[PDB]
């Protein structure tokens, strides 16, 4: 049988219901320039994550307030969202969870965080920098632009001392 056969796998993205719709295409392209997104598949993965969360809150909210269930899981969902920075830490209500949008999830992507921190000039520049392993999420080198930073980790993010700046000074173009 083998251990591998036992391993789970998942489709983390939702493809559209109509794939040639004019409104969806326009917003997608506007989002694509905004966050330096590689393919619509990355945008799709964002919609999926929001839909899971929205449904989880929806079910807990249909359950009556103070029903054991909302206490155990609703507190957990809010905690998780506040700790990834998707949700404002003041809101802290399950009803607010429903009113989230994919853009806000995309905002916590490191490439957007690097740009607001300014460690790079553009969202394009942020993607190239994170790829070159220049970025550090805090004592840890990050090569993946997708990385979603936790709200606490944002301050820890800095260009790693070993990199293009403050270093050997001789990699790539400098060597020749």
């Amino acid at each position: 049988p083998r251990i591998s056969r036992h391993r789970n796998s998942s489709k983390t993205y939702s493809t559209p219901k109509k794939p040639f719709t004019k409104p969806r295409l326009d917003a997608e392209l506007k989002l694509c320039g905004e966050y330096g997104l590689k393919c619509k598949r990355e945008i799709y993965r964002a919609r999926y994550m929001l839909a899971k969360i929205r449904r989880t809150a929806r079910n807990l909210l249909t359950l009556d307030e103070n029903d054991i269930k909302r206490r155990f899981e609703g507190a957990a969902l809010l905690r998780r969202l506040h700790m990834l920075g998707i949700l404002d830490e003041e809101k802290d209500q399950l009803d607010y969870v429903l009113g989230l949008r994919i853009e806000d999830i995309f905002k916590r992507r490191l490439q957007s965080v690097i740009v607001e921190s300014k460690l790079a000039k553009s969202v394009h520049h942020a993607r190239n920098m994170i790829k070159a392993r220049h970025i550090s999420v805090g004592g840890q080198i990050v090569n993946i632009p997708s990385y979603m930073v936790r709200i606490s980790n944002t301050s820890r993010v800095a260009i790693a001392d070993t990199s293009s700046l403050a270093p050997n000074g001789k990699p790539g173009r400098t060597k020749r």
Binding site: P1, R2, I3, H6, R7, I68, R71, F72, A75, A76
Partner: protein, 260 residues
């Protein structure tokens, strides 16, 4: 078909054993002896998982071949020897001895004991039967068979085994009020006093016992093991079967992970 099965698959193995899904495609096949598969846990699992004294099964066999560990005071070389409730797992070379009890979440737990506590182990008589010329015999949960029991002891009445002379020491009979620890099912791992026993003649005597949280748990006589009279008798785990709820355990988990 044909004869017996000498292999156990990892996902078939009991959940309380907490074996890794990707850890292996096979699990230790527990052997027969004093405890059955549903109500046992292999000796290799205590030494490899909780104790971590032996890195691999091979190391556990080497230690066992040299009689490093003694259960019930006897050095046993069975990696798959079944271990269950009140079994005294004493490893003298490491200098540490503990009993094997039940955690609130139902996994078997190693609870440290003093030298007096190490000497004796509790037992539960399943029933008293007549055989071999009519002599009565009492069969403990640990399958220990004792000829000629004192007449007062009845079915389901906890008794204490010397384990040095291996004889009955005393009997705490099962009755209303006496403190018991559930051994199986949803309430497994919970110590409570007996509020009432429902006769339910025909099948399944169902007993209700309540802990000091005012919460009554209803469990049939099969998995009710008396642990002293009103006194808890033998030392009990630190949680003491007080039934922590899911929300409360959520806070405890978060405090533990607060530490880095």
């Amino acid at each position: 078909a044909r004869g017996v099965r000498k292999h156990l698959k990892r996902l078939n193995a009991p959940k309380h054993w907490l074996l890794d899904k990707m850890g292996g495609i096979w699990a230790p096949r527990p052997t027969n002896g004093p405890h059955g598969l549903r109500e046992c846990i292999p000796l290799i699992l205590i030494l490899r998982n909780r104790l971590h004294y032996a890195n691999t099964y091979a190391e556990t066999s080497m230690i066992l071949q040299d009689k490093n560990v003694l259960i019930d005071g006897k050095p046993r070389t069975d990696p798959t020897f079944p271990v269950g409730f009140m079994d005294v797992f004493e490893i003298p070379k490491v200098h540490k001895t503990f009993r094997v009890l039940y955690d609130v979440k139902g996994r078997f737990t190693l609870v440290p004991i003093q030298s007096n506590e190490a000497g004796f182990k509790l037992c539960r008589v399943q029933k008293i039967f007549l055989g071999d010329k009519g002599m009565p015999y009492l069969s403990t949960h640990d399958a220990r068979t004792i000829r000629f029991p004192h007449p007062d002891i009845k079915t389901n009445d906890t008794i204490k085994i010397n384990l040095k002379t291996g004889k009955i020491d005393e009997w705490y009979k099962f009755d209303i009020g006496k403190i018991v620890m559930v051994t199986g099912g949803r309430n497994c791992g919970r110590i409570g006093t007996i509020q009432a026993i429902d006769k339910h003649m025909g099948s399944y005597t169902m007993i209700r016992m309540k802990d000091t949280e005012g919460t009554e748990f209803l469990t049939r006589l099969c998995n009710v093991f008396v642990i002293g009279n009103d006194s808890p008798a033998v030392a009990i785990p630190t949680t003491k079967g007080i039934r922590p709820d899911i929300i409360k355990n959520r806070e405890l988990r978060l405090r533990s992970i607060a530490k880095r």
